Design a protein around this ligand. Structure first.
Ligand SMILES: O[C@H]1[C@H]2OC[C@@H]1O[C@H](O)[C@H]2O
Ligand SMILES: [Ca+2]
Ligand SMILES: [Ca+2]
Ligand SMILES: [Ca+2]
Ligand SMILES: [Ca+2]
Lengths: 382, 385
């Protein structure tokens, strides 16, 4: 009569509470150990990147997916090297950046093992004014299509923060992952119309080959009262230079920030990080459009660029991920504002089985918790 | 080119085609954003003043606080209190004086405070009865109930040292006319174990009562399964009388995750902190009826084994207010060879009567060196290639 002591692998045929029904109906397994989309994340400090003594003049952030070509791993990222660290839009000009990603280029690095990288230099330079991206080219991601390579990126036309963090998405292309990279110059993912959620920002472009097409996911900042809202959308294309057609169901993900996705089984998995009600989840859509919570996780990577071996193969059954590159922002202090690249490792893979990536949390000593203390105003409130 | 979702986030679900995730954003939560979600919060921690732990050498441990209550112009809290010649040594090395585990050879002590930051430790509330009475080995993991002007503490009573054969710890109740005690033990079964083969057959842990729907709704946790690991879920049992016996919900488990139970009335329903383990760890959940719980928010750095101050815990409220502070614990506060736990204070906004945007940021983030401490093992590096 009572619920069994041995946890059933399949939903028992008995009256069940709403929470028990959900444990079976909503997740790939009724326990974390067998949930292929539950994981912990481990972090490794990269070697190979110089940040000018971390004085805020050099930043690297928002890595592309990692790919493997020419016997090595490649990664692209936002690279800012300015004499002055970021000063905010009001105090920016042609040489002083507004935000960490202002006045930036796309650079690239290679690696034999994903732990030590060698910086190769510029991939996408800033185009001349007034072309899309002249102010800053940022937040790129990579697609391979019919033997050629495409870097989609945010293309700033005014310093970030002038009205908001505003831009459309542009693209460059190459015959080799070593470049050189030719700009498409036209906008490829446009802003929405007046009054639409994506009218000011198309951020974090992230393409995956799926269902014979290019599924490119992005984020947009909207609302503003009381605060900005961030959600994620989708646009789909038959050719890498477009036309991209936005899903009529955007936003497809109701939380998160920077997009990170990968083919998984017949569907698409997504990391849903930092913001929104469903922050700190991995999510899954059977069709790449209708996303559900697949797991609840902690210490997620920021702006992950995983190694997705099956990102471009038009796979009919995605295997998932186990490592990549991510970032940490404001690595020192705000007056020397800059980001660093980092490595993460996890098990969101059908081809990796490591119970030591599947513990339920990471815990700390009391002193750590006391640092998340009450302010002066809070203690005064009582 | 399709007509787009609007720039201003609507307060109610708009009448337009929506993705499954946008539908859920409106359908499943109390609000379509964290700022207006009364069950979303952060947690802030404050070091308590008043408790000595023998220089943190592991001989003294305090853990599993009760709900905090207000009586006689002051705040009371009860907790597990261990004071032994040696720290815990494991099941194999335990004896009459040597504890096997942090909660072994312990009693229920209590403390009082004018403010909830400095505590005056009053001493024993529930002593270990003489063997072979329920709890002779250790009395632990208590929670408080006020019922028709009297007080009741529910607690685990160990029958042998944790980790040795015969270490059952059934729930016992003691009662008093004053929160100061003295406390009289009741020596009847309060919440029975499940029948053989059932999820709660060996364990009724972390008892936690709330007055609700004219009755006592007592939530607890059970350890079950075991292969590959134990599974923890939470159940409900209800009584007409504080002495019990309590009758189990036929829908147990009512919460599919979590660990130690912590709950509070909220609106016409009941909210719960779902901590550490299970698929739905790190959530606040809500049940309109106290039985059918849904995820209300996802949160981080949740308190362990929280005992909130729940002003309306006992008043049979028809609309609960929620919580904003209480006591919780930290385990293995120093090192394992000196194993002990400490009591801490937590503050939050899970309250209809508190509105603090500085309790409602979406995360707490650190410098790179913090994350590099969560690195790979040599074994993982070798595997990875
Ligand atoms: O424009 C934004 C985009 O790239 C830089 C800015 O912040 C994040 O990492 C991304 O959402
Ligand atoms: Ca990105
Ligand atoms: Ca796996
Ligand atoms: Ca408790
Ligand atoms: Ca509130």
């Amino acid at each position: 009569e009572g619920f069994p002591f041995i946890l059933p692998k399949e939903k028992p045929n008995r009256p069940l509470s709403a929470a028990m029904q959900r444990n079976y109906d909503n997740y790939m397994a009724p326990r974390p150990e067998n949930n292929e989309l539950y994981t912990q994340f481990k972090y490794t400090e990269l070697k190979g990147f110089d940040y000018n003594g971390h004085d805020g003049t050099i930043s690297r952030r928002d890595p592309s997916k990692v790919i493997y070509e020419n016997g090595k791993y490649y990664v692209w990222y936002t690279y800012r090297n300015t004499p002055t660290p970021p000063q905010g839009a009001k105090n920016s000009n042609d040489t002083i950046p507004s935000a960490d990603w202002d006045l930036a280029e796309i650079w690239y690095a290679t690696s034999k093992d994903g732990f030590t990288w060698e910086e190769q230099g510029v991939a996408v330079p800033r185009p001349p004014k007034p072309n899309v991206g002249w102010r800053s080219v940022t937040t790129t991601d990579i697609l391979k299509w019919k033997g050629k390579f495409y870097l989609y990126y945010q293309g700033f036309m005014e310093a970030s923060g002038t009205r908001g963090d505003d831009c459309p998405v542009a693209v460059s292309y190459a015959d080799s992952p070593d470049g050189p990279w030719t700009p498409h110059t036209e906008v490829v993912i446009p802003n929405g119309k007046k009054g639409e959620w994506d009218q000011y920002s198309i951020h974090d472009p992230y393409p995956i080959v799926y269902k014979d097409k290019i599924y490119l996911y992005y984020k947009s900042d909207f609302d503003g009262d009381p605060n900005l809202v961030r959600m994620q959308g989708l646009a789909i294309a038959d050719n890498p230079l477009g036309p991209f057609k936005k899903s009529p169901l955007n936003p497809v993900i109701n939380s998160g920030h920077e997009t990170t996705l990968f083919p998984f089984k017949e569907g698409m998995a997504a990391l849903v990080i930092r913001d929104g009600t469903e922050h700190n989840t991995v999510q899954y859509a059977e069709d790449g459009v209708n996303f559900n919570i697949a797991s609840i996780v902690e210490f997620m990577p920021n702006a992950a660029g995983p190694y997705v071996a099956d990102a471009f193969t038009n796979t009919k059954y995605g295997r998932g991920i186990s490592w990549g590159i991510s970032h940490f922002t404001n690595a020192t202090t705000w007056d020397q504002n800059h980001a660093v690249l980092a490595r993460f490792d996890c098990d969101l893979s059908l081809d990796v089985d490591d119970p030591h990536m599947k513990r339920l949390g990471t815990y700390f000593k009391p002193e750590f918790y006391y640092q998340m203390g009450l302010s002066k105003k809070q203690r005064e409130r009582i």
